[PDB]
Scaffold this active site. Sequence first.
Site, PDB file in Angstrom:
ATOM      1  N   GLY B  10       0.804  -1.213   0.000  1.00  0.00           N
ATOM      2  CA  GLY B  10       0.000   0.000   0.000  1.00  0.00           C
ATOM      3  C   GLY B  10       0.838   1.264   0.000  1.00  0.00           C
ATOM      4  N   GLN B  14      -2.383   7.147   0.463  1.00  0.00           N
ATOM      5  CA  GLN B  14      -2.162   8.402   1.169  1.00  0.00           C
ATOM      6  C   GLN B  14      -1.260   8.207   2.381  1.00  0.00           C
ATOM      7  OE1 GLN B  14      -5.323  11.329   2.803  1.00  0.00           O
ATOM      8  NE2 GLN B  14      -6.060   9.273   3.239  1.00  0.00           N
ATOM      9  N   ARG B  35       1.377  -1.960  -8.110  1.00  0.00           N
ATOM     10  CA  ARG B  35       0.856  -2.376  -9.402  1.00  0.00           C
ATOM     11  C   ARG B  35       1.357  -1.465 -10.528  1.00  0.00           C
ATOM     12  NH1 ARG B  35      -5.485  -2.765  -8.488  1.00  0.00           N
ATOM     13  NH2 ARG B  35      -5.180  -0.644  -7.601  1.00  0.00           N
ATOM     14  N   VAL B  55      -1.013  -7.602  -4.831  1.00  0.00           N
ATOM     15  CA  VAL B  55      -1.118  -8.379  -3.589  1.00  0.00           C
ATOM     16  C   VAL B  55      -1.986  -9.639  -3.698  1.00  0.00           C
ATOM     17  CG1 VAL B  55      -3.146  -7.291  -2.491  1.00  0.00           C
ATOM     18  CG2 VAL B  55      -1.136  -7.964  -1.111  1.00  0.00           C
ATOM     19  N   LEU B  75      -2.769  -1.435   2.893  1.00  0.00           N
ATOM     20  CA  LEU B  75      -3.659  -1.711   1.784  1.00  0.00           C
ATOM     21  C   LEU B  75      -4.996  -1.023   1.999  1.00  0.00           C
ATOM     22  CD1 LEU B  75      -3.004  -5.523   1.399  1.00  0.00           C
ATOM     23  CD2 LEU B  75      -2.309  -3.677  -0.188  1.00  0.00           C
ATOM     24  N   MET B  87      -8.371  -6.907   0.470  1.00  0.00           N
ATOM     25  CA  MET B  87      -7.493  -6.777   1.635  1.00  0.00           C
ATOM     26  C   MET B  87      -7.308  -8.116   2.349  1.00  0.00           C
ATOM     27  SD  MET B  87      -8.534  -3.071   3.146  1.00  0.00           S
ATOM     28  CE  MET B  87     -10.238  -3.556   3.224  1.00  0.00           C
ATOM     29  N   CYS B 109      -2.825  -1.934   9.197  1.00  0.00           N
ATOM     30  CA  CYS B 109      -3.799  -0.880   9.430  1.00  0.00           C
ATOM     31  C   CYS B 109      -5.180  -1.367   8.989  1.00  0.00           C
ATOM     32  CB  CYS B 109      -3.386   0.364   8.649  1.00  0.00           C
ATOM     33  SG  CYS B 109      -4.499   1.780   8.900  1.00  0.00           S
ATOM     34  N   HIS B 153     -10.396   8.884  11.671  1.00  0.00           N
ATOM     35  CA  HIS B 153     -10.203   9.681  10.473  1.00  0.00           C
ATOM     36  C   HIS B 153      -8.733   9.941  10.186  1.00  0.00           C
ATOM     37  CE1 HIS B 153     -10.848  12.589   7.383  1.00  0.00           C
ATOM     38  NE2 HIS B 153     -10.155  13.507   8.036  1.00  0.00           N
ATOM     39  N   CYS B 188       6.226   1.069  15.697  1.00  0.00           N
ATOM     40  CA  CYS B 188       5.901  -0.309  16.047  1.00  0.00           C
ATOM     41  C   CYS B 188       6.975  -1.294  15.607  1.00  0.00           C
ATOM     42  CB  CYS B 188       4.546  -0.713  15.438  1.00  0.00           C
ATOM     43  SG  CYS B 188       3.161   0.139  16.247  1.00  0.00           S
TER      44      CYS B 188
END
Lengths: 206, 206
Positions: B10, B14, B35, B55, B75, B87, B109, B153, B188
Amino acid sequence: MAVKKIAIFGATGQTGLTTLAQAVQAGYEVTVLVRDSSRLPSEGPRPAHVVVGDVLQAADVDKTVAGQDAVIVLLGTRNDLSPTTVMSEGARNIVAAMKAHGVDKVVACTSAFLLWDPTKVPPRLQAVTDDHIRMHKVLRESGLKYVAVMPPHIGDQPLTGAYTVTLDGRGPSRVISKHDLGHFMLRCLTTDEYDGHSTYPSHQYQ
Amino acid sequence: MAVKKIAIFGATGQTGLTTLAQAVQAGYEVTVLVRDSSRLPSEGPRPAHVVVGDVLQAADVDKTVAGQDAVIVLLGTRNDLSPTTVMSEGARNIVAAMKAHGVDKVVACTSAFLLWDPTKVPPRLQAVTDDHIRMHKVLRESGLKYVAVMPPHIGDQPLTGAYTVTLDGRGPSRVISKHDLGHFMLRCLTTDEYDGHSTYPSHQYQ
Ligand SMILES: NC(=O)c1ccc[n+]([C@@H]2O[C@H](COP(=O)([O-])OP(=O)(O)OC[C@H]3O[C@@H](n4cnc5c(N)ncnc54)[C@H](OP(=O)(O)O)[C@@H]3O)[C@@H](O)[C@H]2O)c1
Ligand SMILES: NC(=O)c1ccc[n+]([C@@H]2O[C@H](COP(=O)([O-])OP(=O)(O)OC[C@H]3O[C@@H](n4cnc5c(N)ncnc54)[C@H](OP(=O)(O)O)[C@@H]3O)[C@@H](O)[C@H]2O)c1
Ligand SMILES: O=C(O)c1cccc(-c2noc(-c3ccccc3F)n2)c1
Ligand SMILES: O=C(O)c1cccc(-c2noc(-c3ccccc3F)n2)c1
């Protein structure tokens, strides 16, 4: 008229109805998008053009934005407070149509809660506020000439034209009449001074 | 157990783009699966390795996971409004590849909707949320060290590095900047304290 042809999204709603009436009185050539089951009332002001459809269909939004000078957005979910993406997804379609058709100016209503401390937003209104947040991000990121209108409580007080416009912060009163809100949406068509700002219209009716 | 080599899935999204940029500036040797490599920026921070593929294609995922120390999953199927399994099927491929190559750490995520009542989900986001739940179960049941990141958000505010993480549900905010979210995904990688936990990053900006 420099801006003369406008699309209004949400013209059948509380603020849309008086915005439409004021725009027609001011000489605007107004196109509205209305859902098939909810047309404009019989003998209120007639707009120049009616598209029947849904803001959730890119094709219907494209038909509504084509050939306009500017767009006014007064979408909302009436008294329904449930989770929704109709305002943000509708804004995504409006952005895409404006880019495809060469329209730059969009004046769009979210809410003063976007300027509140988030921990103070009433939980009952948080699902709607979440979609206002999503909608604001869509419009801000578009690069269009976007006036973010963020009103406090919308009331039934008169049209005055005498309201305060606070830029990029909360204003000194917590109400705006629907008529003054619509007046301000139209005022934003005649000036570039609010482009790229958040605007909080409010007034003390006395 | 120093993490040097990571895969990002991913990376063109964004959150992916700023996570990639931050990871490259910090020194990670980053492999991305894209891709279309033309959606990566041609200037500034660039990944060490680019695998062109999908994926949904186990062999492309295997090529991306081979030799890594950890995997970041960002993703999304933004457009999808109705049942979708991209996903979760991607996660199945990532899990099989991590097991085959002895990669033990995955930070993925989903969304804060997985922490709230199902009736809070806007109807047009139900399909994406359903597949987030499926992806989450794939990763929890894999036995891999899994940090579940469940943001509210995703905003555009500038990086702060000052956000709050709650191991279960609430916070100062229903917003996390995409930059802060990517910062947290990378944090993390340097600790085990979130392994096997769900995390909710949020912050009040401006
Ligand atoms: N005190 C307040 O009430 C307050 C304060 C701050 C901010 N706000 C926000 O201000 C905005 C305007 O509020 P308002 O009271 O003037 O609006 P409203 O009475 O809620 O009207 C909403 C308008 O949006 C139309 N609409 C909804 N879904 C649509 C769809 N799928 N396709 C095309 N049109 C659709 C509605 O059409 P239909 O006739 O078909 O329903 C109606 O014209 C809202 O977003 C609201 O949340 C309200
Ligand atoms: N938008 C929000 O506010 C929000 C809030 C909470 C949670 N979330 C969730 O956060 C996660 C990331 O969101 P985001 O906005 O950063 O994502 P995004 O901008 O929509 O990016 C999705 C990424 O996934 C890639 N992708 C999609 N299908 C793929 C496939 N078959 N194979 C390989 N790559 C594929 C996309 O590649 P391409 O560039 O090739 O399309 C892109 O890089 C999502 O799962 C989202 O649902 C979002
Ligand atoms: O009291 C304030 O300062 C203040 C500020 C922002 C919004 C509001 C507000 N009141 O009703 C609503 C509302 C009512 C029905 C539907 C949607 C709404 F959004 N919104 C009040
Ligand atoms: O917009 C999407 O595609 C998408 C997909 C999955 C989850 C989510 C999501 N979760 O919390 C929120 C949220 C929370 C508070 C305010 C605004 C939001 F938007 N949004 C969005």
